[PDB]
Design a binder for this molecule. Structure first.
Ligand SMILES: C[C@]12CCc3c(ccc4cc(O)ccc34)[C@@H]1CCC2=O
Ligand SMILES: C[C@]12CCc3c(ccc4cc(O)ccc34)[C@@H]1CCC2=O
Lengths: 120, 120
């Protein structure tokens, strides 16, 4: 159903674990099939599991991700977290904001970051 | 005008400095006069500088606040940051998400946190 604050902490942490390994099918299944994803925030949103799968495929395919502090969760199915992505030879500080639906799936994801958060 | 990513880092950091000391008039002046503030996210929004000033007055009046990681800024006048608030004898992990207007003032502020983020 619509995830409690504590359940939101678990789901969002699970998302980060999945990104870290790069299990694309399992990542994609975390989203609603009509999920919208803004990454970075300000860019036009990509929509739906097909467009989202492609995003993660060229994102992660050829990469590491960890939380830098606790997940902050609300009581209306949303949450936000700080993490850092590492890659190739650099690093990127990120904050994701996620809203979950009544099935425990991600309906909306906005990622906040820009080049000032980037470090080679 | 509408603040660049770097300017957003400065503004949002300045907000945190102001909260730390508790300079209420200066905090309030950071907001647009018609700013909406959701704190915590999920609660109904308070609106306008009068309702916002009252919020900070009973919040900070009788308290310390610092960033726990870098501000994450976008290119469309928004940004997000992790910080921790301390008070009385406890501590609270928080993530604020802010949108700025074309005057460098805060038009919308949503704060993400709940009791799982609280620690006595
Ligand atoms: C897309 C990305 C890979 C993964 C990733 C990036 C940026 C923000 C993200 C936010 C997420 O919630 C999950 C993954 C990313 C990367 C930026 C550069 C890059 O290759
Ligand atoms: C309201 C509060 C004081 C300040 C503050 C709290 C919570 C979230 C905040 C978010 C902000 O961007 C600025 C200040 C607060 C506190 C929670 C409890 C409390 O007393």
């Amino acid at each position: 159903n619509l995830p409690t604050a504590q359940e939101v902490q678990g789901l969002m942490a699970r998302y980060i674990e999945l990104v870290d390994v790069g299990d694309i099918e399992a990542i994609v299944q975390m989203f609603a099939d009509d999920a919208t994803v803004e990454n970075p925030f300000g860019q036009p949103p990509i929509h739906g599991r097909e467009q989202i799968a492609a995003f993660f495929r060229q994102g992660l395919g050829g990469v590491r991700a960890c939380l830098t502090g606790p997940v902050r969760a609300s009581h209306n199915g949303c949450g936000a977290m700080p993490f850092r992505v590492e890659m190739v030879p650099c690093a990127l500080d990120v904050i994701d904001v996620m809203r979950f639906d009544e099935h425990g799936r991600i309906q909306t994801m906005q990622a906040f970051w820009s080049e000032v958060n980037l470090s080679v």
